[PDB]
């Protein structure tokens, strides 16, 4: 009546705001149901029942360049040299990269 | 100012649809569409003021709901360019390769591109056999011998 | 009556607050019954009889 | 202001359901739902003011109670992705390996991945036998011989 209507509008806005997820290209998301992992979201539109599901973590899915700091190594000829190295890392679509290591 | 109820709805709907185009994430769409429909319903049918907000909220919920089924029906069995775009593990399925080192105990490594990948097979396979990938587990590739 | 109702609301809030446990992914919790270890909680919703 | 009892409940329920979405842990849900149901009961049925809080508290308790059974029924015999996700000891069950060093006194070490794990078996097993894991105790793996 007098005070119900603004509350109803606000409730509708909040539920739609927190129940609709859009995932960009080059990423995947994870859905936690009260904490437990249940499923993963690919890029697109996704509806998750609110107040029970939330977003776990954001997983990049593109090759990444990763420096390795300077390092001192001894060769087989007993030669002391210093090197630096670079790495490429890619995450296979598994959710493991979020929950199997910190 | 207030004698006309539908004007408020048909203004708010347009304003929210316009606010979309500022760089939104599609959150405001689901309420603007509902506001437009609420205006087109109230203007034709004089619903009670306490019966307006309920219909507007329900219309927002259904506005958000219907396109999910529309889009999801569209995605499956129809679009596959993005499905094969950003998942490598499914890309390697079905490809054929050759082996340079024999598998011991049904496990080893195989050259792909310029790098190597771990492979596992049901039986020990010698060096120089044509193999084809079936499934992927973790990062390990299942391979089986295939005739040329 | 006059003073029971607020106390009842507060009691309900406190019991629900301290009897419902949610465990994040990548962790496990342990439940002690007056001090003794009895069981472990995996990630999800868990009800433990409070106090 | 106070002549309408159901309005208070149907406002508090909505406000708490909204307070959820600020980043809560689900604590406030169980009372907001009860408040909404209390409003929908008082509005239809004029219960006594001293008979409102009791029903609201009992409704909070049952609101928290029912979903536990719903979710727990859902989890068992239906969902196993998270069950096999973050427990390694159960992952190793059923896998097959080979031995490089003979077991002495029914105990030894076995190579898995790039590391080693302690293993125990009922009888002494020589080097080069196919073995399969059965159970796990502490970090020790029970193994038994399996034919190829």
From Swiss-Prot, chain A:
A GO term, aspect molecular function: identical protein binding
Subcellular location: Cell inner membrane
Keyword Transmembrane: yes
Secretion signal, residue range per the UniProt entry: none
Location, primary (coarse class): membrane
UniProt entry keywords in alphabetical sequence: Cell inner membrane, Cell membrane, Membrane, Transmembrane, Transmembrane helix
Mutant phenotype after disruption: No visible phenotype.
Keyword NAD: no
GO cellular component, one term: plasma membrane
Ranges in the topological domain labelled Periplasmic: 1-2
TM segment ranges: 3-23
Summary of the function given for this chain in its UniProt record: Identified as a multi-copy suppressor of an FtsH/HtpX protease double disruption mutant. May play a role in the quality control of integral membrane proteins.
Family: Belongs to the band 7/mec-2 family.
Subunit structure: Forms oligomers. Probably interacts weakly with FtsH.
Protein name per its UniProtKB record: Protein QmcA
Organism, scientific name: Escherichia coli (strain K12)
Lineage: Bacteria, Pseudomonadati, Pseudomonadota, Gammaproteobacteria, Enterobacterales
Gene this protein is translated from: qmcA
Shown chain mapped onto the complete sequence: 1 to 102 of 305
From Swiss-Prot, chains B, D:
Spans traversing the lipid bilayer: 1-17, 28-48, 51-71
Full protein name: Inner membrane protein YbbJ
Cytoplasmic side: 18-27, 72-148
Compartments where located: Cell inner membrane
Family label: To M.jannaschii MJ0826.
Species this chain originates from: Escherichia coli (strain K12)
Swiss-Prot/TrEMBL keywords: Cell inner membrane, Cell membrane, Membrane, Transmembrane, Transmembrane helix
Any one annotated GO CC term: plasma membrane
Periplasmic side: 49-50
Pfam families: NfeD
Database matches in InterPro entries: Membrane_assoc_protease (IPR052165), NA-bd_OB-fold (IPR012340), NfeD-like_C (IPR002810)
Membrane topology: Multi-pass membrane protein
């Amino acid at each position: 009546m007098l005070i119900f209507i603004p509350i109803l509008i606000f409730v509708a806005l909040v539920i739609v705001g927190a129940g609709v997820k859009i995932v960009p290209q080059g990423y995947q998301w994870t859905v936690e149901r009260f904490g437990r992992y249940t499923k993963t979201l690919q890029p697109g539109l996704s509806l998750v029942v609110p107040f029970m599901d939330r977003i776990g973590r954001k997983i990049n899915m593109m090759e990444q360049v990763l420096d390795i700091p300077s390092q001192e190594v001894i060769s087989k000829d007993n030669a002391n040299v210093t090197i630096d190295a670079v790495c490429f890392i890619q995450v296979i679509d598994a959710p493991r990269a979020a929950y199997e290591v910190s | 100012m207030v004698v006309h109820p539908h004007i408020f709805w048909l203004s708010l709907g347009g304003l929210l649809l316009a606010a979309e185009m500022l760089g939104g994430n599609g959150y405001l769409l689901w309420s603007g569409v509902a506001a437009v429909i609420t205006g087109l319903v109230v203007w034709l049918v004089p619903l009670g003021w306490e019966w307006q907000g309920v219909m507007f909220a329900i219309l927002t919920l259904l506005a958000a709901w219907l396109w999910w089924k529309w889009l999801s029906r569209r995605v499956r069995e129809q679009k596959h360019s993005d499905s094969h775009l950003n998942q490598r593990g499914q890309q390697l399925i079905g490809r054929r390769f050759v082996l340079e080192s024999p598998l011991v105990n049904g496990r080893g490594h195989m050259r792909v591109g310029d790098s190597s990948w771990p492979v596992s097979a049901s039986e020990d396979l010698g060096a120089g056999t044509h193999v084809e990938v079936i499934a992927i587990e973790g990062i390990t590739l299942h391979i089986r011998a295939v005739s040329s």
